[PDB]
Amino acid sequence: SLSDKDKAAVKLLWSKISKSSDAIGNDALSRMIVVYPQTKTYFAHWPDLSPGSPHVKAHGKTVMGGIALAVSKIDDLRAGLLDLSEQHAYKLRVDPANFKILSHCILVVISMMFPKEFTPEAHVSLDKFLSGVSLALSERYR
Amino acid sequence: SLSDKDKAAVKLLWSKISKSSDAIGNDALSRMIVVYPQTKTYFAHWPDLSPGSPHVKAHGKTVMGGIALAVSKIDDLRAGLLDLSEQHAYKLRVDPANFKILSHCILVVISMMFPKEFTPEAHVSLDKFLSGVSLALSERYR
Amino acid sequence: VEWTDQERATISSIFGSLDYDDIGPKALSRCLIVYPWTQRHFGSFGNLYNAEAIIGNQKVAAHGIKVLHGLDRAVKNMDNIKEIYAELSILHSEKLHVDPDNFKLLADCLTIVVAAKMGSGFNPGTQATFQKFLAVVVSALGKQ
Amino acid sequence: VEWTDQERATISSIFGSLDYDDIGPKALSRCLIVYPWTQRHFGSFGNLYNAEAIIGNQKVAAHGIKVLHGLDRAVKNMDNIKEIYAELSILHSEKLHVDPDNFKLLADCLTIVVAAKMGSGFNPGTQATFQKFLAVVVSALGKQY
Ligand code: HEM
Ligand code: HEM
Ligand code: HEM
Ligand code: HEM
């Protein structure tokens, strides 16, 4: 669970990086597809999946809108992300290993873009947060 | 999260097998240390780890007492098992990979001992419960 | 990996006490129920939408029997498991893009169904050797 | 694992550009903080009480530097990685009994600290080659398990 310390840390970090959310989402999604190509088949209905391609850029923004929703719903991620869970865990049957992969790519991109803000303390709180997001997305598997 | 269906399933199975909890725990702990001998080092401070060890038998009872506590606290495992989490996750620094190993060994033993009660449906609910127990035990890592 | 004369006997003994037609469908059914994201790989296999349907599905059943026959080849050539599973690794870990976590999950369901069938004969030492065998198989199915 | 000339150059450039005395301690400190059960394997290394302690711990720092020098061995022999880490695999299995899942976690921490150090030059294709290399290394480290 997220302590108040963790929530404060995530909110402060988000306050510093949210203006860059479109770019974060495009880079993160681009890296999941090329660094972990097993995920490409989830998006095969879009023909150009190169880094920064129109569909990747657009969906990157969508993903980060889901992260901003999670920050607003940080006191109850499971309730907050229920619809997103029904889509990912039940309708799309995304393998939960892939939630870990996208979470890792988000942390790599935030570390790359905001090295001074992404301290070891910010890292452990945001990883606890992304673990909480991933578990919330896993709510409707079974 | 556990649904009312899962919780009924777990309460029902436990009510049928709890009378053999001593043996379930000895069998399960015994299997963890033989089948996954990387876990032996966690108990190396006891004088005997061999098959039939008295220390293994005694601790198997202790572990299933923790399961019995979790069944009674099934509506709030994080709080119910907070003290066990401080011990496991913070003081002992148990690798969370090993919570999955013991959970698997407990399922193997219940399957073996209670094959007609251990339906695929009982299995999915009890695995969700052991996953929640493992997550509750991981509360105090970080 | 090194294998002892007793380990080979033990693996041979475990598989010879099983009916693959019984165990195969039980193991795969359980995996598709307990770890239902794995259904994403079985779209052309018919009804998967609840447990009753999966357990009754004879296409799933046939496939689980195929898995047991595929393990039998390994039982038979225990020092070359990585090689005879070469093509299956490409299948699973290239053509179907199955995350390898899932190989462990299916092996765990098999262990659970084998333990119910064998009862007390599946003692801790037998389990230990069975798991050592499955770990070899899982690795072989693993990338590269 | 086969390598192209470009993959070899990319790995050489990523590691060639790093100060191992800076990156090693950060990567290992972050693993001990973010995945703190890994502290169980560092019992002779001093204070691991909290993030400040770990980051200030020079025994941990020196060990992180040793890890990067160990990776350097694979950088300089990219076709012999399984062989060159056979002894290290035994070390991690038989002395420490570390679950191989944790090798991926330290690699992930390394990638995060490299990304912060390298900036946008750590582009997606560069990360893909680096993860490929780290996967070969992690597979070599669990082989003796
Ligand atoms: C941090 C974890 C993730 C978040 C926050 C997230 C967020 C989102 C959001 C906000 C949507 C749009 C919902 C809608 O269409 O109404 C979406 C759709 C989607 N997600 Fe994710 N997602 C996550 C992880 C993943 C992963 C790991 C995969 C697969 C590898 C994935 C695959 C998809 C697909 C296939 C779609 C639908 C795209 C389409 O419109 O065709 N998601 N996700
Ligand atoms: C996930 C299911 C588990 C449950 C329900 C459980 C339960 C318990 C309980 C009830 C105790 C006694 C606490 C006390 O009063 O001292 C205990 C202690 C302990 N557990 Fe577990 N445990 C679990 C998993 C594990 C695992 C996976 C390991 C390591 C492989 C482990 C290692 C230990 C150790 C080393 C102690 C203390 C032994 C001593 O007294 O020296 N536990 N556990
Ligand atoms: C780790 C234990 C496993 C073993 C020994 C195994 C074995 C087999 C074998 C022998 C075949 C038949 C090959 C053929 O006739 O072409 C097969 C096919 C297949 N396996 Fe597995 N498998 C394992 C795990 C899994 C898992 C975990 C999944 C997915 C969740 C998976 C998905 C598939 C699919 C989709 C096919 C057939 C493709 C099709 O007919 O459309 N397997 N497997
Ligand atoms: C990518 C994964 C890893 C790599 C490349 C790696 C590399 C190394 C190297 C090169 C050494 C010996 C250094 C020297 O003496 O020159 C070493 C030792 C050690 N490693 Fe790792 N390591 C990995 C993961 C881990 C993890 C995940 C843990 C803990 C959970 C760990 C714990 C240790 C410890 C405690 C030692 C010292 C053992 C001794 O010699 O007494 N390592 N590792």
Q: Nearest chain C Cα to A94, which residue?
A: C37
Cβ–Cβ below 8 Å for D37 and B89 = yes
In order of A24, A39, A122, D114, the CA distances from A113 in angstroms are 8, 23, 14, 12
User: Residue type at D130?
Assistant: F
Q: Which chain A residues are closer than 8 Å to B135 by Cβ?
A: 135
- For residue B137 and ligand 2, the question of a CB distance below 6 A is answered with yes
Cross-chain CB nearest to A78 (options B1, B128, B142)? B1
Closest to C47 measured CA to CA, from C39, C58, C37, C57: C57
User: Residue type at B127?
Assistant: D
Count of beta carbons in the 10 Å neighbourhood of residue A34:
20
Distance between CA atoms of residues A109 and A69, nearest Å: 19
**Domains within chain C, CATH numbers bracketed:** 1-144 (1.10.490.10)
Contact D11, D114 (CB under 8 A): no
Cβ–Cβ below 8 Å for D116 and A51 = no
DSSP D49: S
Q: How far is C119 from chain D (nearest CA, A)?
A: 29
Collapsing DSSP states into helix, strand and coil, what is residue D48?
A: coil
Contact C50, C14 (CB under 8 A): no
φ, ψ at D44 (rounded to 5°)? -95, 15
Sequence length of chain B is: 142
Distance between CA atoms of residues C128 and C4, nearest Å: 13
Distance between CA atoms of residues D42 and C125, nearest Å: 31
Count of beta carbons in the 10 Å neighbourhood of residue C3:
15
Q: Where on the phi/psi map is residue D97: left (φ > 0), alpha (ψ -120 to 50), or beta?
A: left
Distance between CA atoms of residues D99 and D106, nearest Å: 12
DSSP A55: H
Burial label for C84, CB within 10 Å (0-12, 13-18, 19+), is middle
User: Residue type at B48?
Assistant: D
Distance between CA atoms of residues A140 and A67, nearest Å: 18
User: Residue type at B98?
Assistant: N
Q: How far is CA B35 from the centre of its chain?
A: 16
Look up the domain containing A101 and give its range.
1-142
CATH number of B51's domain:
1.10.490.10
Distance between CA atoms of residues B133 and C9, nearest Å: 37
In order of A31, C12, C126, the CA distances from C9 in angstroms are 48, 5, 11
List of long-range contacts for C91-98, beta carbons under 8 Å, 24+ apart:
C92/C141, C93/C141, C93/C142, C93/C143, C94/C143, C96/C41, C97/A37, C97/A38, C97/A41, C98/C41
**Nearest ligand to the C-alpha atom of residue C40:** 3
Sequence length of chain D is: 145
Q: Nearest chain D Cα to A27, which residue?
A: D124
- Structure obtained using: X-ray
* Tally of structural domains, chain A: 1
Tokens encoding A89: 């865990």
Q: Rounded to a whole number, what is the distance in angstroms from the first to the last CA of chain B?
A: 21
How many Å lie between the centroid of ligand 3 and the Cα of residue C79?
22
Q: Nearest chain C Cα to A138, which residue?
A: C37
Q: Which chain D residues are closer than 8 Å to B89 by Cβ?
A: 37
- For residue D102 and ligand 4, the question of a CB distance below 6 A is answered with yes
C-alpha angle D131-D136-D142 in degrees, rounded to nearest 5? 120
List of long-range contacts for D18-22, beta carbons under 8 Å, 24+ apart:
D18/D68, D18/D114, D18/D117, D20/D65, D20/D68, D20/D69, D20/D72, D21/D65, D22/D117
A42 membership: H or E segment, kind and range: none
The residue whose two tokens read 């989830």 is A42
Cβ–Cβ below 8 Å for B98 and D102 = no
Probe residue for ligand 3, chosen from C76, C91, C93, C95 as the CB with the greatest number of ligand atoms within 8 Å: C91
B38 membership: H or E segment, kind and range: none
Count of beta carbons in the 10 Å neighbourhood of residue D43:
10
Tokens encoding C110: 């098999």
Compute the Cα dihedral for B127, B129, B132, B138 and give only its sign. Answer: negative
Tokens encoding C48: 């998967």
Collapsing DSSP states into helix, strand and coil, what is residue B14?
A: helix
C-alpha angle D43-B98-B20 in degrees, rounded to nearest 5? 130
Tokens encoding B46: 């006891």
In order of A3, B20, B140, the CA distances from D52 in angstroms are 19, 47, 18
Closest to D134 measured CA to CA, from D49, D37, D4, D14: D14
C-alpha angle B11-B14-B15 in degrees, rounded to nearest 5? 85
**Interhelix angle for B97-113 vs B120-137, to 10°?**
150
Q: How far is CA B51 from the centre of its chain?
A: 19
Count of beta carbons in the 10 Å neighbourhood of residue C23:
21
Count of beta carbons in the 10 Å neighbourhood of residue A28:
25
Closest to D113 measured CA to CA, from D10, D25, D12, D16: D25
Contact A16, A114 (CB under 8 A): yes
- For residue B67 and ligand 2, the question of a CB distance below 6 A is answered with yes
Tokens encoding B38: 């990387």
List of long-range contacts for A66-75, beta carbons under 8 Å, 24+ apart:
A67/A21, A67/A25, A67/A106, A67/A133, A68/A14, A68/A18, A68/A21, A70/A129, A70/A132, A70/A133, A70/A136, A71/A10, A71/A11, A71/A14, A74/A2, A74/A7, A74/A10, A74/A11, A74/A129, A75/A7
